[PDB]
């Protein structure tokens, strides 16, 4: 809570969880989760 952020890391932060997301995305796409809204098997498509 009390420690202070540095901007360039706060930028870079926003490309990390874009980058967490591809690596979702390209990973479930391999698992066969394909464009879905939640996290349901049923339909077997996925949010990310």
Do not use: F, T
Not at 4 to 20: C, S, T
Not at 37 to 45: A, E, I, L, S, T
Request: glycine residues 4%; aromatic residues 6%; contains cysteine.
């Amino acid at each position: 809570s009390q420690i202070v952020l540095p901007p360039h890391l706060e930028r870079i932060r926003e490309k990390l969880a874009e980058n967490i997301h591809e690596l979702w995305v390209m990973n479930k796409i391999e698992l066969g989760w394909q464009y879905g809204p939640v996290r349901d098997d049923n339909k077997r498509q996925h949010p990310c």
